Amino acid sequence: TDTYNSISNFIENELTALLSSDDYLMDDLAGPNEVCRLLKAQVIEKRKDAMSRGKQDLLSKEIYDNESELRASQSQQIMELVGDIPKYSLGSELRNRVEGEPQSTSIERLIEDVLKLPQMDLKVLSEYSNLRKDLILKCQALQIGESKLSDILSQTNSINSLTTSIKEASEDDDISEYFATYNGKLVVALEEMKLLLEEAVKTFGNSPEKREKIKKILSELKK
Amino acid sequence: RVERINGLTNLQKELVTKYDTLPLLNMNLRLSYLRDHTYPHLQVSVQSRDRVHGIEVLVVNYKFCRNTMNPFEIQFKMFYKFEDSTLLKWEILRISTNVRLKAKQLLATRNFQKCLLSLYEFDKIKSKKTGIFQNLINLLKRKTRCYLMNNSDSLIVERVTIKLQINFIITMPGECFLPMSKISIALWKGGERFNQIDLDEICYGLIKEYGVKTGLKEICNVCLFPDM
Amino acid sequence: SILRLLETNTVSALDSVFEKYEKEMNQMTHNNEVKRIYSKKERLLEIILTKIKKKLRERDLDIEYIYSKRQFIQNRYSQELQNNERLEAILSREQNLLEETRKLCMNLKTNNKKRLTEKLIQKDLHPVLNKADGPVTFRNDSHELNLMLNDPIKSTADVRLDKEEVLSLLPSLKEYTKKSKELKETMGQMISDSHEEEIKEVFV
Amino acid sequence: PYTWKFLGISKQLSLENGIAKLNQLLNLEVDLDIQTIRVPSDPDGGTAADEYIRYEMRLDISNLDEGTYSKFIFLGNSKMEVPMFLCYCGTDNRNEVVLQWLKAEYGVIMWPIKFEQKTMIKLADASIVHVTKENIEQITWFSSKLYFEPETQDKNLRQFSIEIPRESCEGLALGYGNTMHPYNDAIVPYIYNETGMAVERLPLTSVILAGHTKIMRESIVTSTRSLRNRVLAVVLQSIQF
Amino acid sequence: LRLEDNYVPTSDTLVVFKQLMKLPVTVLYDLTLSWFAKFGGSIYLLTETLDLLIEKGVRRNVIVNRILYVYWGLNVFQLAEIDCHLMISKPEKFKWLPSKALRGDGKPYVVKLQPAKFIENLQTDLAKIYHCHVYMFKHPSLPVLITRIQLFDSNPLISRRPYYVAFPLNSPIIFHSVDKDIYARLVLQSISRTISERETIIFKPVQKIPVKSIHNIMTLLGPSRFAESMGPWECYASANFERSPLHDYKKHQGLTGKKVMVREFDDSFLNDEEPEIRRLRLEKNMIKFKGSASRYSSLVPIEKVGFTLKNEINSRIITIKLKFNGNDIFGGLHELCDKNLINIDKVPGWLAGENGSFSGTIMNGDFQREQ
Amino acid sequence: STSDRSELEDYIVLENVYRMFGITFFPLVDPIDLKIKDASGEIFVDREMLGIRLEVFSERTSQFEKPHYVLLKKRIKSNSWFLFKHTIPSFIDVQGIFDDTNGGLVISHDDAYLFAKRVFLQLVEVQKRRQIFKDLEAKKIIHDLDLDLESSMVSFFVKDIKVELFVKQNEIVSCSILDNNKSKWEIALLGSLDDLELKLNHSFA
Amino acid sequence: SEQLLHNYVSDSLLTTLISFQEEQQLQHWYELLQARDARVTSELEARIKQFFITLRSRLLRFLESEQLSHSLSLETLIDALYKINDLLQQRLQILDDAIQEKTSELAEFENMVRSPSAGDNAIPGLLQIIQSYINLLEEN
Amino acid sequence: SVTTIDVLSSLFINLFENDLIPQALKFRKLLYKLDLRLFQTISDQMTRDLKDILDINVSNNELCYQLKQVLARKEDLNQQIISVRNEIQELKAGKDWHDLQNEQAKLNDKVKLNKRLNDLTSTLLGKDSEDDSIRDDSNILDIAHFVDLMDPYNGLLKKINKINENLSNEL
């Protein structure tokens, strides 16, 4: 972040500022003034393009170009590291559970995200594999339990419909006595119906209305 | 000229003077589209209608005659408001004793539209079910023994031994509002039952891939397995 | 001839400070108040030499303002250059994502062709090769009958249906199973004692 | 882009005389040609007032510029009610001079000619019939564009424009049958049958044959610098009483 | 580099003055209290002075002086609120342009967005490229959610043209402002990237000619009964002709009857009083170009429309290319039909006004709009 | 005509009884394509039309709602209907349902009845999801709420807490509570839509 | 990088014009001059070297702090999956509670329809009545 | 070019003054050279300031040109990012990728169905069972049969009850 300004500030305030102030005229600690001014005049005379304020801008741009060409290799090699399940491949709710604050919990989207995460530090790899297996078993048991709950709900619906129907058709609160004596109401029914067949065997003695009686019996016992 | 068309008029004079996009006012053609095309095999007949002083009573009975052998009837009685038209009360006078427990939990929604549509779609679904099952009778009576069970909800075929039961259950709604069908199969190889999950996957694949009328015939072809 | 005087005064202050920076070590010969009071003498010598130079002499071109403009231009240059580096990183990331998506699509197309080619070699003769109007009449007969098939369990990518762990994760299914077994046995005993399959069969 | 402009003439005027006065007034050498053209060379005309007389009167200036070269095409017939008319292109300033001479030497009444809608239809009908030397008529086809511009309330509908390409135009005229009037017997009944828009009642602005002409309600723009015999015959036939 | 509401951009003051001169006093007072409770600057004792100025009947230049020179632009949020209130106040001067939101197979996708969590994701995805600011509000009269996206650039920060996107509540059709720059493509692509969160969405455009107001484009393409009928079928999109089944049967259409004029099927129109017949002819034109009953302006004024009628006679393909223009096309065609200039028995369906504000080829008598 | 009025009254009340079913077919002609034969003077319709009338019966107000019309026109070169006009709003994909039924080609009347039944079930589930929340608002168990046009995204209040639901076809698929303890109350309500009424009284007892 | 800074520094010193103009009284000056002009290029070559190690480590630790805002670890994902596992365990718990309520309803129905008796005798009576009814029906 | 003339004038004036101070120099001797160093610093810093003004002007012009180049590359990178993101979004939501996805799903369904069919035809003849109920459906049938047996309206006790009363009705 802002490396060009740091390079140019290094070039200006550390390289040119030290090679100009005391690197030219303050060399007389080991020494008169005339020979030091002559050598300083020759030095600033036969140098006046290298330490300009416009050549060092080009050198700063060249140093930035070198560091950008070295940063390019590091950026294209920093994405080819050990990836370890990166983003854009998990589900929506998984990568919302990563960042925190989901604000809306669901079960269908969580199931569709858990049944989508891939498979494979090695102890953490085994722990993640066991956790993936456990969560997939959670989703399997969730779907099986939901289907069995719908089936048992329809079952209790039919049971409650039968009990409400017999309570309305009886209106006497004798539901337990209804099933126990259902055999009793049927043994007196077929015994009394045999008396009607005995009264219709050799009393009418017909042959054309017998077909109508047989059709009425076989269409009332079936329709 | 200028004409004033009415409800009862011939179609040619209706079509001469037709420059709007409104429905045709011919009541016989409109009742023909309402009766022969959108709701076939249904005999609606209004029995009586009275009024008070502001409401209008209306007794109408239906006869769902898609099954011609033993159709079930029902009879309604509705109470209007006849201006700012709401529906105050509606009650059921008589039901033919065949759908009476099936239309017991359904007829407590206090929504007559859902009960009418559910009864019509239920008898249509029952007619399609007995058609599919009778088609499976007619193509298997010479090779196997094939008898029905319960009421009609599970056809059973048997050969050599090996048995196969094809469930077809229609569940009326109660505690969507249209009746739904459920198809499940179960095999027996003489000894014991097979795995229900593998049979459910095979049935789901063979019905999702082929169909319902031609899908179950493939299931009987696999349960034969003398040739392939 | 006033901006030159201002620049000469600024350079005079800077050079007086730079000479005092060496006078801080060159004052050990002679004391400490003999340099802070003697500095005003030599500062007046530069104040009289600038006074004589003021009579020996014009755009308003200053060094500090144009140096500040250079610093502002350089700071905006570094900001736009850093923005270009950030957009280069974003473009490299999106190009890598595009290449991964394209290789995924091409790999799945090649795998589809390979699986369709090997599906011919294997044995699918009687029940599947009658179609391979097929999957479009099921939707007709499913929106016609309101069909609810037995929905299979969702795909787990080779994590098989461990029925033991599913049954152990729902401890009520075993109780429901045995209760349904006792209920079915009770209803079967009530049905067989009534002879429902006997008298309804001989009658028709 | 030679925008013609049409006027009327109350008396059949021969220009054998007076042209010396025009050469005196303008000090140029204007030219004439005495053609006796004949419209509808097909023999189903009966030859009853069928011959016209055309006086093409050029201002003999060279072709270094186009606005300086302004024809004056007359046409006339001594059997009708309004006997002649004149049409001129260009924007040269001698046009007012020759109009002033034609008024002040012959004593004729000039009025500008405004076209109706069916006259514009008959003008686009006759601006495509090409002429041949083998006394037979051929038709070239152009992609027309009938441009309308009505005056509705609140300027609801400002301007609309039917446009018919060349191949569909040819297909319509061949589907009608063998005729020499496509735009009045094939195209306009087709537009009325398919859109309901009666074109001879709608406010036509400018029938535009693409590339060839651009008819308007007052003027005619033409690609070449001349007009056909059938166009001027339709123009003279339209302004009768 | 995403901008907060307290940031003050650079802008001239005369354009904010001309913006504030287009508002009434009461919304200016409400904006004053809202920005002072939100931001403040130079509690409620200061606001009590403004309560007398509206109660006295003072000029608007004084109150825009008061609101422009105690916040001495204001910031980005108050500028967004000013421009959005100008959008609400005078809506007939903007210009919207629709775009459907497909997905996956090609089936359309109902949006169903939340106006809090969407703005954070859109501002985050747009902040990685430019300096964005996103301000979403809800229209008081219509059920839309007009987003306003404004992108800034650096030579403070200069301001570009703001880009509005108007989401309806439950439709796959998203309207937006007409712009063909790179900023329109960036904002629309970022919206199509961050509205999804589950599976990818593409914004294909459904129309090329922009529609004027926001009531008009909501009537045409938003969630409404008039989205498909729009023409002579407008009697079905308002249910003028049928009552409930529980209603009275004495006042039925099939019992009272309607008054109709006998149509002519012989071509006797091109060869051409009793004001009952005049009233019925005007009612017939009104029935054909509208529902069943100013006096020419349609339900939605449509500016530019051009068809391409492709018939087929004796194995030829005969194309004609009608191309209309104006302020209200089908009202003008109604007026031309009313001056007896166009036969009304031969006006087809697509010319009467159905599939309104669309334009495309007509093969086999079936309209199919242009891509 | 005084017995013909009684016959017309019987026909009208039979039409109303048939319209109470919800899904009805009604005849149509388009006034553009009425053509004459010119050999007998009789008028025949060129392209047949068929309109569907879907009219959902409300229950909270006990009166029928505004009807929704779907009009099919017969294609001139295929003998199959296509979706001409419809007044069904844009959150129901009507052209997608019409391309989904029978593959895309609708020929017979029951093939159109299946299409009518699918769009009718969508209209009924939208009406039911609106009516359940309105009846919750009427009993003061929830406070002032906002609805969508299809009522698939609601945000009502409780005595203190604001609850946001994204509800699918008569089941809640996503709950949101804003103001560890919040997640249990969020997956509490994440069920059906009548069980939501059973649960919102289970906390305010 | 450093190969440009060394050229820029050693190309601007007193080693560029003094080796051209070069008895012993003028030899002790320019020998000690370039030797003390070698002290500056020693301490500054360590300055330009230490700066780029400071610069690149400030750039490398920035780039490593930008990739981990787009990549995931194997510890936060495990914590999120623990939270999702707790969520699904709570969902399975309330589902099992509903199943327990429904099988309690089944247990309430189960004792309502029982009949502990010896009802094969009435079953045999029904079979005998069936035989008598078949005898009375088939002989008619 | 007033900067060069001011440089020449200031250099000549300060050089004459510095030569006078140097001749005066040759607080016994450490006082005179302080003003000499001050005059040399004034001349050096003044000519350095003039050279700095010229170099800063030409450097600011060059930096403004290169900043314009970097803004051009910024617009180029903006268009490139937008086009790459557009092709990415039109790749994932296209007909071809979804079509091959559904073809892969259909091939997987057919492979699993044929594998299950082959295993079923194997366990019929060549070389499963049930021991628990994890997904069963043999319970709703028996309950439906029991409800249709003990119906108080139709049932089987009432089907006989509408026969024995109808048997005496034919008498």
PDB file of N, CA and C in Angstrom, chain E residues 108 112 114 169-172 223 225 228-229 233 236 238 241-243 245-246 249 252 254-255 263 265 347 349 354-355 365-366, chain F residues 8-9 12 16 19 28 30-31 34 43 47 53 55 64 67-69 75 82 84-87 90-91 93 148-150 153:
ATOM      1  N   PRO E 108     -38.164 -17.190 -15.822  1.00  0.00           N
ATOM      2  CA  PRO E 108     -37.944 -15.927 -15.112  1.00  0.00           C
ATOM      3  C   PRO E 108     -37.909 -16.126 -13.607  1.00  0.00           C
ATOM      4  N   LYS E 112     -37.862 -10.603  -5.021  1.00  0.00           N
ATOM      5  CA  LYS E 112     -38.123 -10.727  -3.579  1.00  0.00           C
ATOM      6  C   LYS E 112     -36.909 -10.325  -2.739  1.00  0.00           C
ATOM      7  N   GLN E 114     -34.753  -7.776   0.029  1.00  0.00           N
ATOM      8  CA  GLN E 114     -34.910  -7.045   1.281  1.00  0.00           C
ATOM      9  C   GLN E 114     -34.168  -5.726   1.187  1.00  0.00           C
ATOM     10  N   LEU E 169     -42.244  -5.100  -6.677  1.00  0.00           N
ATOM     11  CA  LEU E 169     -42.236  -5.953  -5.497  1.00  0.00           C
ATOM     12  C   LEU E 169     -42.129  -7.431  -5.856  1.00  0.00           C
ATOM     13  N   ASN E 170     -42.917  -7.907  -6.813  1.00  0.00           N
ATOM     14  CA  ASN E 170     -42.939  -9.329  -7.140  1.00  0.00           C
ATOM     15  C   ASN E 170     -42.908  -9.552  -8.648  1.00  0.00           C
ATOM     16  N   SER E 171     -41.989  -8.886  -9.340  1.00  0.00           N
ATOM     17  CA  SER E 171     -41.889  -9.156 -10.764  1.00  0.00           C
ATOM     18  C   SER E 171     -40.457  -9.447 -11.172  1.00  0.00           C
ATOM     19  N   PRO E 172     -40.261 -10.285 -12.193  1.00  0.00           N
ATOM     20  CA  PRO E 172     -38.929 -10.452 -12.778  1.00  0.00           C
ATOM     21  C   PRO E 172     -38.480  -9.292 -13.649  1.00  0.00           C
ATOM     22  N   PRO E 223     -46.292  -5.811 -11.918  1.00  0.00           N
ATOM     23  CA  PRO E 223     -47.302  -6.807 -11.550  1.00  0.00           C
ATOM     24  C   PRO E 223     -48.686  -6.186 -11.512  1.00  0.00           C
ATOM     25  N   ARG E 225     -52.909  -6.393 -13.665  1.00  0.00           N
ATOM     26  CA  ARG E 225     -53.790  -7.065 -14.603  1.00  0.00           C
ATOM     27  C   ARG E 225     -53.613  -6.559 -16.025  1.00  0.00           C
ATOM     28  N   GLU E 228     -50.795  -7.706 -19.879  1.00  0.00           N
ATOM     29  CA  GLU E 228     -50.874  -8.475 -21.109  1.00  0.00           C
ATOM     30  C   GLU E 228     -52.048  -8.049 -21.982  1.00  0.00           C
ATOM     31  N   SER E 229     -53.116  -7.526 -21.379  1.00  0.00           N
ATOM     32  CA  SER E 229     -54.317  -7.241 -22.162  1.00  0.00           C
ATOM     33  C   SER E 229     -54.180  -5.943 -22.957  1.00  0.00           C
ATOM     34  N   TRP E 233     -58.734  -5.731 -25.216  1.00  0.00           N
ATOM     35  CA  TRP E 233     -58.926  -6.712 -24.163  1.00  0.00           C
ATOM     36  C   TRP E 233     -58.855  -6.097 -22.776  1.00  0.00           C
ATOM     37  N   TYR E 236     -61.218  -7.155 -19.861  1.00  0.00           N
ATOM     38  CA  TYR E 236     -60.903  -8.310 -19.035  1.00  0.00           C
ATOM     39  C   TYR E 236     -59.949  -7.968 -17.907  1.00  0.00           C
ATOM     40  N   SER E 238     -60.152  -5.309 -16.105  1.00  0.00           N
ATOM     41  CA  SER E 238     -60.850  -4.534 -15.095  1.00  0.00           C
ATOM     42  C   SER E 238     -62.199  -5.114 -14.702  1.00  0.00           C
ATOM     43  N   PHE E 241     -67.699  -6.391 -17.042  1.00  0.00           N
ATOM     44  CA  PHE E 241     -68.861  -7.013 -17.659  1.00  0.00           C
ATOM     45  C   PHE E 241     -69.494  -8.122 -16.829  1.00  0.00           C
ATOM     46  N   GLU E 242     -68.794  -8.664 -15.839  1.00  0.00           N
ATOM     47  CA  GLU E 242     -69.296  -9.781 -15.053  1.00  0.00           C
ATOM     48  C   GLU E 242     -69.240  -9.449 -13.569  1.00  0.00           C
ATOM     49  N   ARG E 243     -70.275  -9.860 -12.849  1.00  0.00           N
ATOM     50  CA  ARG E 243     -70.324  -9.741 -11.403  1.00  0.00           C
ATOM     51  C   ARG E 243     -69.970 -11.093 -10.784  1.00  0.00           C
ATOM     52  N   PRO E 245     -70.714 -14.738  -8.903  1.00  0.00           N
ATOM     53  CA  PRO E 245     -71.811 -15.707  -9.059  1.00  0.00           C
ATOM     54  C   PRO E 245     -72.895 -15.593  -8.006  1.00  0.00           C
ATOM     55  N   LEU E 246     -72.611 -14.979  -6.863  1.00  0.00           N
ATOM     56  CA  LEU E 246     -73.602 -14.767  -5.818  1.00  0.00           C
ATOM     57  C   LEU E 246     -74.443 -13.520  -6.045  1.00  0.00           C
ATOM     58  N   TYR E 249     -79.365 -11.973 -10.353  1.00  0.00           N
ATOM     59  CA  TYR E 249     -79.514 -12.432 -11.724  1.00  0.00           C
ATOM     60  C   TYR E 249     -80.536 -11.628 -12.507  1.00  0.00           C
ATOM     61  N   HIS E 252     -78.438  -9.008 -14.883  1.00  0.00           N
ATOM     62  CA  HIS E 252     -77.428  -9.737 -15.630  1.00  0.00           C
ATOM     63  C   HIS E 252     -77.326  -9.157 -17.033  1.00  0.00           C
ATOM     64  N   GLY E 254     -76.921 -10.945 -19.692  1.00  0.00           N
ATOM     65  CA  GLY E 254     -77.718 -11.798 -20.548  1.00  0.00           C
ATOM     66  C   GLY E 254     -79.206 -11.753 -20.300  1.00  0.00           C
ATOM     67  N   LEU E 255     -79.679 -10.861 -19.435  1.00  0.00           N
ATOM     68  CA  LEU E 255     -81.111 -10.704 -19.212  1.00  0.00           C
ATOM     69  C   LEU E 255     -81.618  -9.329 -19.612  1.00  0.00           C
ATOM     70  N   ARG E 263     -73.203  -4.838 -38.020  1.00  0.00           N
ATOM     71  CA  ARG E 263     -71.995  -4.580 -38.790  1.00  0.00           C
ATOM     72  C   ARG E 263     -72.239  -4.804 -40.275  1.00  0.00           C
ATOM     73  N   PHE E 265     -70.405  -6.217 -43.683  1.00  0.00           N
ATOM     74  CA  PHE E 265     -69.313  -7.048 -44.157  1.00  0.00           C
ATOM     75  C   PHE E 265     -69.045  -6.897 -45.645  1.00  0.00           C
ATOM     76  N   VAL E 347     -59.436  -2.560 -38.865  1.00  0.00           N
ATOM     77  CA  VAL E 347     -58.299  -2.336 -37.978  1.00  0.00           C
ATOM     78  C   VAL E 347     -58.008  -3.651 -37.267  1.00  0.00           C
ATOM     79  N   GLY E 349     -55.866  -6.392 -34.586  1.00  0.00           N
ATOM     80  CA  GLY E 349     -55.691  -6.339 -33.147  1.00  0.00           C
ATOM     81  C   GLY E 349     -54.463  -5.553 -32.729  1.00  0.00           C
ATOM     82  N   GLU E 354     -53.469  -3.465 -28.556  1.00  0.00           N
ATOM     83  CA  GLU E 354     -53.043  -4.625 -27.789  1.00  0.00           C
ATOM     84  C   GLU E 354     -51.548  -4.850 -27.973  1.00  0.00           C
ATOM     85  N   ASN E 355     -50.983  -5.657 -27.070  1.00  0.00           N
ATOM     86  CA  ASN E 355     -49.547  -5.760 -26.757  1.00  0.00           C
ATOM     87  C   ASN E 355     -48.866  -4.393 -26.821  1.00  0.00           C
ATOM     88  N   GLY E 365     -50.402 -13.924 -38.675  1.00  0.00           N
ATOM     89  CA  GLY E 365     -51.356 -13.267 -37.812  1.00  0.00           C
ATOM     90  C   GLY E 365     -51.005 -13.278 -36.340  1.00  0.00           C
ATOM     91  N   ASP E 366     -49.810 -13.738 -35.976  1.00  0.00           N
ATOM     92  CA  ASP E 366     -49.397 -13.861 -34.585  1.00  0.00           C
ATOM     93  C   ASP E 366     -48.264 -12.887 -34.313  1.00  0.00           C
TER      94      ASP E 366
ATOM     95  N   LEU F   8     -84.641 -18.282 -19.377  1.00  0.00           N
ATOM     96  CA  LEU F   8     -83.377 -17.565 -19.283  1.00  0.00           C
ATOM     97  C   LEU F   8     -82.922 -17.417 -17.840  1.00  0.00           C
ATOM     98  N   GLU F   9     -83.864 -17.271 -16.906  1.00  0.00           N
ATOM     99  CA  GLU F   9     -83.520 -17.205 -15.489  1.00  0.00           C
ATOM    100  C   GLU F   9     -82.961 -18.534 -14.996  1.00  0.00           C
ATOM    101  N   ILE F  12     -79.446 -18.795 -16.401  1.00  0.00           N
ATOM    102  CA  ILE F  12     -78.503 -17.905 -15.729  1.00  0.00           C
ATOM    103  C   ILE F  12     -78.138 -18.446 -14.351  1.00  0.00           C
ATOM    104  N   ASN F  16     -74.532 -19.706 -12.937  1.00  0.00           N
ATOM    105  CA  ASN F  16     -73.917 -19.248 -11.692  1.00  0.00           C
ATOM    106  C   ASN F  16     -73.508 -20.421 -10.805  1.00  0.00           C
ATOM    107  N   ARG F  19     -70.398 -21.656 -12.276  1.00  0.00           N
ATOM    108  CA  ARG F  19     -69.304 -20.727 -12.025  1.00  0.00           C
ATOM    109  C   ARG F  19     -68.815 -20.794 -10.593  1.00  0.00           C
ATOM    110  N   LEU F  28     -65.716 -17.451 -26.956  1.00  0.00           N
ATOM    111  CA  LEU F  28     -65.168 -16.206 -27.469  1.00  0.00           C
ATOM    112  C   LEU F  28     -65.120 -16.239 -28.981  1.00  0.00           C
ATOM    113  N   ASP F  30     -63.136 -13.450 -31.848  1.00  0.00           N
ATOM    114  CA  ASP F  30     -62.390 -12.218 -32.049  1.00  0.00           C
ATOM    115  C   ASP F  30     -63.054 -11.435 -33.174  1.00  0.00           C
ATOM    116  N   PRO F  31     -63.396 -10.162 -32.973  1.00  0.00           N
ATOM    117  CA  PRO F  31     -64.080  -9.395 -34.021  1.00  0.00           C
ATOM    118  C   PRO F  31     -63.245  -9.076 -35.252  1.00  0.00           C
ATOM    119  N   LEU F  34     -63.710 -12.433 -37.994  1.00  0.00           N
ATOM    120  CA  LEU F  34     -65.028 -12.873 -38.449  1.00  0.00           C
ATOM    121  C   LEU F  34     -65.080 -12.604 -39.943  1.00  0.00           C
ATOM    122  N   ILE F  43     -72.036 -16.257 -41.554  1.00  0.00           N
ATOM    123  CA  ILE F  43     -70.779 -15.795 -40.981  1.00  0.00           C
ATOM    124  C   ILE F  43     -70.159 -16.931 -40.187  1.00  0.00           C
ATOM    125  N   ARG F  47     -60.510 -18.152 -36.784  1.00  0.00           N
ATOM    126  CA  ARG F  47     -59.685 -18.743 -35.739  1.00  0.00           C
ATOM    127  C   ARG F  47     -60.511 -18.849 -34.469  1.00  0.00           C
ATOM    128  N   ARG F  53     -62.022 -18.859 -17.150  1.00  0.00           N
ATOM    129  CA  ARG F  53     -62.402 -17.923 -16.093  1.00  0.00           C
ATOM    130  C   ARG F  53     -62.058 -18.566 -14.756  1.00  0.00           C
ATOM    131  N   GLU F  55     -61.896 -18.026 -10.846  1.00  0.00           N
ATOM    132  CA  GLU F  55     -62.489 -17.096  -9.893  1.00  0.00           C
ATOM    133  C   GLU F  55     -62.444 -17.738  -8.510  1.00  0.00           C
ATOM    134  N   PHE F  64     -66.848 -14.022  -3.546  1.00  0.00           N
ATOM    135  CA  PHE F  64     -65.915 -14.307  -4.625  1.00  0.00           C
ATOM    136  C   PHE F  64     -65.031 -13.100  -4.903  1.00  0.00           C
ATOM    137  N   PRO F  67     -62.314 -11.930 -10.770  1.00  0.00           N
ATOM    138  CA  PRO F  67     -61.948 -13.087 -11.588  1.00  0.00           C
ATOM    139  C   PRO F  67     -60.705 -12.821 -12.416  1.00  0.00           C
ATOM    140  N   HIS F  68     -59.978 -13.895 -12.699  1.00  0.00           N
ATOM    141  CA  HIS F  68     -58.808 -13.859 -13.559  1.00  0.00           C
ATOM    142  C   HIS F  68     -59.120 -14.609 -14.842  1.00  0.00           C
ATOM    143  N   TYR F  69     -58.869 -13.966 -15.974  1.00  0.00           N
ATOM    144  CA  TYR F  69     -59.208 -14.518 -17.273  1.00  0.00           C
ATOM    145  C   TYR F  69     -57.947 -14.936 -18.006  1.00  0.00           C
ATOM    146  N   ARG F  75     -53.986 -21.791 -33.189  1.00  0.00           N
ATOM    147  CA  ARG F  75     -52.977 -21.452 -34.178  1.00  0.00           C
ATOM    148  C   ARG F  75     -53.442 -21.865 -35.570  1.00  0.00           C
ATOM    149  N   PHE F  82     -52.543 -21.433 -28.165  1.00  0.00           N
ATOM    150  CA  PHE F  82     -51.413 -20.702 -27.622  1.00  0.00           C
ATOM    151  C   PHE F  82     -51.944 -19.576 -26.752  1.00  0.00           C
ATOM    152  N   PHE F  84     -52.900 -16.454 -25.704  1.00  0.00           N
ATOM    153  CA  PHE F  84     -53.088 -15.156 -26.330  1.00  0.00           C
ATOM    154  C   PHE F  84     -53.010 -14.033 -25.305  1.00  0.00           C
ATOM    155  N   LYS F  85     -53.976 -13.985 -24.391  1.00  0.00           N
ATOM    156  CA  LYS F  85     -54.063 -12.945 -23.378  1.00  0.00           C
ATOM    157  C   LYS F  85     -54.356 -13.585 -22.033  1.00  0.00           C
ATOM    158  N   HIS F  86     -53.860 -12.959 -20.972  1.00  0.00           N
ATOM    159  CA  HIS F  86     -54.135 -13.431 -19.626  1.00  0.00           C
ATOM    160  C   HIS F  86     -54.043 -12.257 -18.667  1.00  0.00           C
ATOM    161  N   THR F  87     -54.913 -12.249 -17.664  1.00  0.00           N
ATOM    162  CA  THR F  87     -54.895 -11.232 -16.618  1.00  0.00           C
ATOM    163  C   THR F  87     -54.352 -11.785 -15.312  1.00  0.00           C
ATOM    164  N   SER F  90     -47.709 -11.049 -12.699  1.00  0.00           N
ATOM    165  CA  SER F  90     -46.416 -11.445 -13.229  1.00  0.00           C
ATOM    166  C   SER F  90     -45.611 -12.346 -12.305  1.00  0.00           C
ATOM    167  N   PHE F  91     -46.023 -12.538 -11.054  1.00  0.00           N
ATOM    168  CA  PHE F  91     -45.299 -13.456 -10.185  1.00  0.00           C
ATOM    169  C   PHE F  91     -45.724 -14.904 -10.374  1.00  0.00           C
ATOM    170  N   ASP F  93     -45.781 -17.632 -13.369  1.00  0.00           N
ATOM    171  CA  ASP F  93     -45.244 -17.829 -14.713  1.00  0.00           C
ATOM    172  C   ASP F  93     -46.270 -18.587 -15.535  1.00  0.00           C
ATOM    173  N   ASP F 148     -46.387  -8.628   0.765  1.00  0.00           N
ATOM    174  CA  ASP F 148     -46.061  -8.548  -0.649  1.00  0.00           C
ATOM    175  C   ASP F 148     -47.356  -8.654  -1.451  1.00  0.00           C
ATOM    176  N   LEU F 149     -47.250  -8.646  -2.781  1.00  0.00           N
ATOM    177  CA  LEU F 149     -48.448  -8.823  -3.597  1.00  0.00           C
ATOM    178  C   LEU F 149     -48.924 -10.268  -3.564  1.00  0.00           C
ATOM    179  N   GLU F 150     -48.006 -11.209  -3.367  1.00  0.00           N
ATOM    180  CA  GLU F 150     -48.360 -12.610  -3.222  1.00  0.00           C
ATOM    181  C   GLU F 150     -48.257 -13.086  -1.784  1.00  0.00           C
ATOM    182  N   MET F 153     -43.501 -12.810   1.639  1.00  0.00           N
ATOM    183  CA  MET F 153     -42.453 -12.207   2.458  1.00  0.00           C
ATOM    184  C   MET F 153     -43.142 -11.208   3.382  1.00  0.00           C
TER     185      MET F 153
END
